[PDB]
Design a protein around this ligand. Structure first.
Ligand code: POG
Ligand code: 9KL
Ligand code: 9KL
Ligand code: 2J3
Ligand code: 2J3
Length: 582
């Protein structure tokens, strides 16, 4: 393997190679049209093929970054399409590659992912599968420039499974949509989980992600020994570092090598692996990625005996910190399948901080004897929040619960851009729908782990154009304390309210063309803007002025001439709003 391109082509096979290269280009160049990307893919794939034939062929010895780079720059369009991706080809490797990476956009300016009509969609699918899935991987990857690439391949396969079933049946849409919405929601959660893994590695270092993986894998495979869970964490950290950095072919090859390793060792890892290890490669790794927890081995000693009683606690911590704190996370997490990963990391942090304090005293055991008892308040803190918010979710339902959170978050961090506030509050709402229904003991980990990915999305959206200082502080001070940090924010009483824009409540007629989902987004946008104008208004005053947004909408979109309805109701809403809010 002196030729990388040949080595990856041979390892992943033509079909995945082509998909991974398409995703690679789609993530780096999110604005470029499909045609350009398919050209680059063929050019790279032709080069791959020339090298597999004869490793001595021209460019066969380049790095994958060189090859992607040399194909990108030779392309006619880029400098006109992009201002600052013109900039990058003005560097050499590794600077050139690093540059492309920093331009990845977490919210590229693109219209929503078009879901054509059921028969239309089924027709495209039968017409030309290859073109259909190429467009699919492009449209998702460009909108989610850190999506776990091997998993995006899996989603394309699932999408094909769903189409194959539904497209032939008597009603199309009726079969299709509940499945395509299930799939979309599962893929969005996948993208948000991977975005958190990349942000952990990139902002906080490999160790931030290794501790998170150690905890999760300890809980999933508690019968595995610390050595094996450690080897898996190491390999997984490498896989995610590669995928998060755009080394998609290496990431897919390494992930497939890991799945193969775990299958070849399943007896000593988990009996639950047999489900997965019988499947084809993408289903097999997907299955492993989300596998349900094994049962805890019977007969494990009391966790106090290694971590509080052993005379060598301070010695171990001082002489081999990561090994000893890793063993702490492995032992505590395997014993606690029903804690969120983040709580287990916060307990790991408290245990560490207690050792740091206690081991510098005359009597460390006297100092840290109660360390494990001192966890309970941390355990109990996320409980009260979950119970109060899940009863509010139960009572208000999705739409009003989202509204409630929208008003609460806009008052906490009112400098945040309205689209971000809307998107985050809507996501925080979906945590209610996903989590509140589970038995109480599964609720905590569901909610807490889900809130991590939603807050990380807020942090990554805010990172690029920082506008609020509390968000910068909560996002930058920790990974694991982000949720308590945001929880503790009261209303910002420092923010100067915005004065009243006429232009905020009339969006011409294009609004009349929007599906139900988008109308609600528009209402929610108006709500955020009302809160930014009048942060002290009552919930009922807010609702009223939105109710009157609901009217001016129904009115012009019930009326023959919406435009003339606009002159009559648009300012008049300026008026009725003054009446209601002052
Ligand atoms: C070989 O030793 C084990 C190692 C491979 O596991 C990964 C390593 C990064 O674990 C760090 C962990 C012990 O940090 C604890 C510490 C409270 O966690 C801090 C974290 C939450 O930021
Ligand atoms: C009174 C009620 C409660 O606490 O039981 C409550 C509390 C917070 C929010 C809301 C809303 O649904 C809402 C809807 C639109 C705009 C603003 C608020 C309702
Ligand atoms: C952290 C943040 C805050 O309050 O600062 C917040 C906002 C809304 C809800 C929750 C929840 O715990 C929760 C519980 C059930 C469903 C969805 C969210 C937490
Ligand atoms: O799977 C993706 C394939 C079907 O598309 C390859 C195009 C870009 O040439
Ligand atoms: C191109 C090929 C069509 O048969 O795509 C099928 C879907 C399921 O997968 C996408 C490829 C890239 O793995």
């Amino acid at each position: 393997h002196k030729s990388e391109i040949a080595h990856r082509f041979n390892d992943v096979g033509e079909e995945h190679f082509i998909g991974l290269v398409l995703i690679t280009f789609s993530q780096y160049l999110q604005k470029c049209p499909y045609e350009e990307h398919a050209k680059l893919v063929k050019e790279v794939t032709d080069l791959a093929k020339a090298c597999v034939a004869d490793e001595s062929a021209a460019n066969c010895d380049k790095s994958l970054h060189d090859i992607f780079g040399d194909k990108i720059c030779a392309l006619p369009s880029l400098r006109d399409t992009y201002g600052d991706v013109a900039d990058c080809c003005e560097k050499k490797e590794p600077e050139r590659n690093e540059c492309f990476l920093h331009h990845k956009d977490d919210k590229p300016d693109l219209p929503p992912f078009a879901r054509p009509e059921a028969d239309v969609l089924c027709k495209a699918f039968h017409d030309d599968e290859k073109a259909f899935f190429g467009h699919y991987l492009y449209e998702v990857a460009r909108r989610h420039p850190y999506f776990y690439a091997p998993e995006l391949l899996y989603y394309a396969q699932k999408y094909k499974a769903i189409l194959t079933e539904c497209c032939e049946a008597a009603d199309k849409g009726a079969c299709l949509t509940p499945k395509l919405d299930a799939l979309k929601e599962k893929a969005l959660i996948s993208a948000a989980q991977e975005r958190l893994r990349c942000a952990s590695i990139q902002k906080f270092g490999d160790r931030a992600y290794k501790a998170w993986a150690l905890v999760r894998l300890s809980q999933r495979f508690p019968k595995a020994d610390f050595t094996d869970i450690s080897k898996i964490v190491t390999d997984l950290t490498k896989v995610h570092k590669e995928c998060c950095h755009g080394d998609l072919l290496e990431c897919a090859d390494d992930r497939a090598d890991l799945a193969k390793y775990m299958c070849e060792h399943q007896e000593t890892i988990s009996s639950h692996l047999k489900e997965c290890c019988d499947k084809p490669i993408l289903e097999k790794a997907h299955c492993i990625y989300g596998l349900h927890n094994d049962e805890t081995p019977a007969g494990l000693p009391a966790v106090a005996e290694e971590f509080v009683e052993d005379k060598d606690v301070c010695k171990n911590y001082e002489e081999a910190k990561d090994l000893f704190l890793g063993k702490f996370l492995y032992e505590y997490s395997r014993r606690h399948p029903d804690y969120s990963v983040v709580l287990l990391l916060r307990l790991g942090k408290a245990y560490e901080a207690t050792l740091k304090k206690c081991c510098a005293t005359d009597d460390p055991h006297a100092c840290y004897a109660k360390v494990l008892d001192e966890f309970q308040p941390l355990v109990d803190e996320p409980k009260n929040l979950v119970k109060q918010n899940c009863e509010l979710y139960e009572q208000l339902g999705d739409y009003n619960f989202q509204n409630a959170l929208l008003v609460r978050y806009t008052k906490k961090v009112p400098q945040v851009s309205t689209p971000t506030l809307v998107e985050i509050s809507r996501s925080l709402g979906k945590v209610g729908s996903k989590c509140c229904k589970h038995p109480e003991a599964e609720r905590l980990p569901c909610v807490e782990d889900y809130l991590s990915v939603v807050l990380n999305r807020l942090c990554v959206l805010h990172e690029k154009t920082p506008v609020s200082e509390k968000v910068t502080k909560c996002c930058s001070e920790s990974l694991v304390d982000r949720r308590p940090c945001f929880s503790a924010l009261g209303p910002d009483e420092t923010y100067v309210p915005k004065e009243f824009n006429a232009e905020t409540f009339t969006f011409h007629a294009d609004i009349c063309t929007l599906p139900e989902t988008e109308r609600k987004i528009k209402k929610q946008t108006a709500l955020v803007e009302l809160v930014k104008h009048k942060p002290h208004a009552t919930n009922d005053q807010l609702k009223t002025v939105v109710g009157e947004f609901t009217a001016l909408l129904d009115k012009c979109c019930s009326a023959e001439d919406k435009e003339a309805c606009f002159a009559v109701e648009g300012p008049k809403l300026v008026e009725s709003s003054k009446a209601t809010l002052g």
